[PDB]
Amino acid sequence: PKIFCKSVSKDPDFRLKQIDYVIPVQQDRSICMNNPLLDISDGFFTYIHYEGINSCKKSDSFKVLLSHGEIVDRGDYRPSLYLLSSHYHPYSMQVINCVPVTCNQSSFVFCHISNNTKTLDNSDYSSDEYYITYFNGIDRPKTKKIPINNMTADNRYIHFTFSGGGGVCLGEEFIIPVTTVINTDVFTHDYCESFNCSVQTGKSLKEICSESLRSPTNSSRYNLNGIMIISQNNMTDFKIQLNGITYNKLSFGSPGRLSKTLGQVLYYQSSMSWDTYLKAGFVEKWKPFTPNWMNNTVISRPNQGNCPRYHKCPEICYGGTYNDIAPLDLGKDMYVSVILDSDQLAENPEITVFNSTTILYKERVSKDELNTRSTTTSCFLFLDEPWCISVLETNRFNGKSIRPEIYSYKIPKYC
Amino acid sequence: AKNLEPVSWSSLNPKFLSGKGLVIYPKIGDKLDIICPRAEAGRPYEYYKLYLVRPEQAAACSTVLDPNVLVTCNKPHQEIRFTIKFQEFSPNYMGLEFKKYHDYYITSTSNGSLEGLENREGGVCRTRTMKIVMKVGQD
Numbered sequence: 001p002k003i004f005c006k007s008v009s010k011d012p013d014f015r016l017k018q019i020d021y022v023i024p025v026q027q028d029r030s031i032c033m034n035n036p037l038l039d040i041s042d043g044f045f046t047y048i049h050y051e052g053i054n055s056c057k058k059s060d061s062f063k064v065l066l067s068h069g070e071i072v073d074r075g076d077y078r079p080s081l082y083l084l085s086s087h088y089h090p091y092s093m094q095v096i097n098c099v100p101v102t103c104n105q106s107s108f109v110f111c112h113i114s115n116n117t118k119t120l121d122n123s124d125y126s127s128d129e130y131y132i133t134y135f136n137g138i139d140r141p142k143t144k145k146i147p148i149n150n151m152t153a154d155n156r157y158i159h160f161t162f163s164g165g166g167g168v169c170l171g172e173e174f175i176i177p178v179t180t181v182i183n184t185d186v187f188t189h190d191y192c193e194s195f196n197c198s199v200q201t202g203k204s205l206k207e208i209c210s211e212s213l214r215s216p217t218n219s220s221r222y223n224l225n226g227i228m229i230i231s232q233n234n235m236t237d238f239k240i241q242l243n244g245i246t247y248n249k250l251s252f253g254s255p256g257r258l259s260k261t262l263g264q265v266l267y268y269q270s271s272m273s274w275d276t277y278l279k280a281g282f283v284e285k286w287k288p289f290t291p292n293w294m295n296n297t298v299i300s301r302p303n304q305g306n307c308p309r310y311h312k313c314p315e316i317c318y319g320g321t322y323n324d325i326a327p328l329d330l331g332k333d334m335y336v337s338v339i340l341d342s343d344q345l346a347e348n349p350e351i352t353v354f355n356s357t358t359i360l361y362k363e364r365v366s367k368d369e370l371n372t373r374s375t376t377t378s379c380f381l382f383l384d385e386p387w388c389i390s391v392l393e394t395n396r397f398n399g400k401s402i403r404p405e406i407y408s409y410k411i412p413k414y415c
Numbered sequence: 416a417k418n419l420e421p422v423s424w425s426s427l428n429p430k431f432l433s434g435k436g437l438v439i440y441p442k443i444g445d446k447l448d449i450i451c452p453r454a455e456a457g458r459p460y461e462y463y464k465l466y467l468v469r470p471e472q473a474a475a476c477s478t479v480l481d482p483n484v485l486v487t488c489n490k491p492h493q494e495i496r497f498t499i500k501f502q503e504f505s506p507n508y509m510g511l512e513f514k515k516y517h518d519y520y521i522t523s524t525s526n527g528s529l530e531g532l533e534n535r536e537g538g539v540c541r542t543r544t545m546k547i548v549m550k551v552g553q554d
């Protein structure tokens with residue numbers, strides 16, 4: 001591990017610079033550019049975002065943009081983004097959800113496409129379509145249909161969607177964050193049942209914990225997170241597994257991501273239910289999919305209602321924001337995330353560097369009030385130094401000209 | 416930039432007018448607080464589930480069709496609250512956007528009792544007409 005600040009610090013120097021030249025700007029200021037996604041691997045990057053007219057829901061978005069590019073040194077003494085390719089998704093009006101993964105210097109985008117916007121409530125996954133869209137700097141995009149009919153599930157799932165901030169490529173196989181649906185309650189919650197806490201009167205703990213994985217719209221359905229493994233040869237042969245996440249510390253199905261970092265694979269899952277502290281950990285066993293969950297007493301997220309920041313006590317509730325994280329040093333157990341410092345409101349991004357116990361240092365991204373929802377953060381070694389790029393889903397000018405922002409910053413060498 | 420008067424949610428609250436309900440004209444970038452008061456001495460606790468509904472559902476007083484449930488006051492002993500900033504980009508599960516010149520509706524179909532916490536049809540909406548309408552950016 002190289003030399004950078006691994007302990008508490010006041011007023012640090014992140015060398016924060018914003019990158020405004022990668023994401024398109026739109027002539028129409030009624031268009032809303034939302035739910036940005038970025039996955040950076042091997043010096044190349046894949047960015048994805050959803051533009052839709054007068055609404056920032058992903059389902060409503062009427063075209064969704066895919067772009068591939070490269071990390072390149074300008075003599076600038078900092079890493080910079082170079083944009084190689086931009087296309088719009090063929091089926092974008094029918095896109096429910098997408099996840100990026102950057103592999104062997106090319107961009108892939110895995111997608112869940114449906115004629116029905118509510119398809120995760122009424123329908124089942126044989127009624128919808130699943131695609132890989134992949135391209136590069138020189139060549140033209142090619143979007144293949146994934147043969148879900150030959151797929152081996154580790155349980156009986158009636159539906160699934162690609163959901164999250166990025167996938168991974170290990171060898172000849174892809175691994176993508178998915179959220180899945182099953183209509184019968186097959187799940188065991190020990191961790192949740194462990195809590196001695198105030199509860200809704202007239203309802204048991206085991207009852208509450210079990211009623212918590214149920215979808216907020218169709219109460220007859222359980223959303224449980226998982227992964228999809230696609231083995232492929234030249235996009236002709238396919239072998240597709242759908243595995244669920246380990247039952248150890250379950251939480252209501254939410255978007256989350258996989259990333260290769262420091263020779264590990266880190267899993268993150270947005271905390272959208274009663275447990276509001278950071279849910280993440282490295283993957284210690286693939287079958288079943290088993291992240292070793294961090295016990296993190298400090299990093300949290302806002303939500304309105306009965307499950308706001310720093311709330312860790314069972315209840316059935318839904319909401320919160322995705323602010324994902326990336327590992328700095330294993331040895332000191334350190335991570336960065338652009339997290340929202342608010343209790344309920346979604347706002348005030350702060351680059352925060354923390355360990356499992358305490359926050360090492362932080363810096364607010366904007367001095368003025370700033371509206372932010374999703375935050376993805378990726379890190380890499382540049383000129384033998386730790387450097388980060390974060391994409392923030394932002395509403396900067398009061399509801400018009402919505403557009404995500406990109407920042408790059410360096411982890412301080414001196415405390 | 417103003418913090419509006421916190422709106423207590425109880426059968427006991429007068430700010431709710433029988434015909435109109437509770438109306439306010441908030442400006443974008445304004446905070447507002449909705450509270451579930453805890454059981455006061457000599458009074459019974461009131462249990463509720465506050466939904467977000469379209470106008471058609473506010474007139475009919477039915478929350479059955481689509482469920483955006485904000486707060487549910489199922490704890491009598493600790494008061495829980497709900498904070499609203501009128502920007503877009505709330506951390507809401509169903510997604511919630513606050514835009515200029517739009518009308519927004521919050522209301523409950525619950526009994527006011529533990530047994531009737533989950534009632535989707537009618538409820539306090541009909542009787543005391545406990546509901547909140549928000550016309551953002553109107554005078």
Ligand SMILES: *[C@@H]1O[C@H](CO)[C@@H](O[C@@H]2O[C@H](CO)[C@@H](O[C@@H]3O[C@H](CO)[C@@H](O)[C@H](O)[C@@H]3O)[C@H](O)[C@H]2NC(C)=O)[C@H](O)[C@H]1NC(C)=O
Nearest residue numbers: 006007008009331332333334354355356357358359360361
């Ligand atoms: C999480 O990260 C924090 C980083 O600050 C760790 O807390 C710190 O732990 C070190 C030792 O590991 C403490 O150093 C000590 O300083 C005291 C003087 O106050 C001295 O008497 C000792 O001999 C030692 O040198 C440091 O004080 C402490 N920080 C605070 C604010 O108390 C923490 O250990 C990390 N936890 C995990 C689980 O990684």
Ligand SMILES: *[C@@H]1O[C@H](CO)[C@@H](O[C@@H]2O[C@H](CO)[C@@H](O)[C@H](O)[C@H]2NC(C)=O)[C@H](O)[C@H]1NC(C)=O
Nearest residue numbers: 120121122123124158182183217218219220221
């Ligand atoms: C809630 O989910 C249930 C369970 O998947 C849905 O019920 C199924 O609907 C399909 C067709 O839509 C039928 O062929 C099955 O027989 C149903 N199964 C059961 C167990 O009911 C239901 O459609 C969903 N309801 C809503 C309102 O979304």
Ligand SMILES: *[C@H]1O[C@H](CO)[C@@H](O[C@@H]2O[C@H](CO)[C@@H](O)[C@H](O)[C@H]2NC(C)=O)[C@H](O)[C@H]1NC(C)=O
Nearest residue numbers: 524525526527528529530531532533534535538
């Ligand atoms: C509110 O309505 C609910 C349901 O409509 C009532 O609960 C039922 O009440 C009927 C008669 O009033 C009983 O026969 C049922 O056994 C009750 N069911 C349950 C699950 O309790 C409830 O009592 C009503 N309460 C108030 C205060 O209006």
Ligand SMILES: *[C@@H]1O[C@H](CO)[C@@H](O)[C@H](O)[C@H]1NC(C)=O
Nearest residue numbers: 103104169171172173232234
């Ligand atoms: C690049 O990705 C492909 C998957 O399309 C994989 O089969 C191949 O092994 C990768 N290259 C290397 C050097 O691992």
Ligand SMILES: *[C@@H]1O[C@H](CO)[C@@H](O)[C@H](O)[C@H]1NC(C)=O
Nearest residue numbers: 281282292293294295296356
């Ligand atoms: C969290 O605690 C459990 C047991 O307390 C342990 O198995 C797990 O490894 C811990 N997390 C980390 C990151 O060590």
Ligand SMILES: *[C@H]1O[C@H](CO)[C@@H](O)[C@H](O)[C@H]1NC(C)=O
Nearest residue numbers: 094113114115116127128129
């Ligand atoms: C709806 O989508 C399906 C594939 O998901 C397709 O086969 C069908 O033709 C579409 N119908 C339309 C676009 O009317």
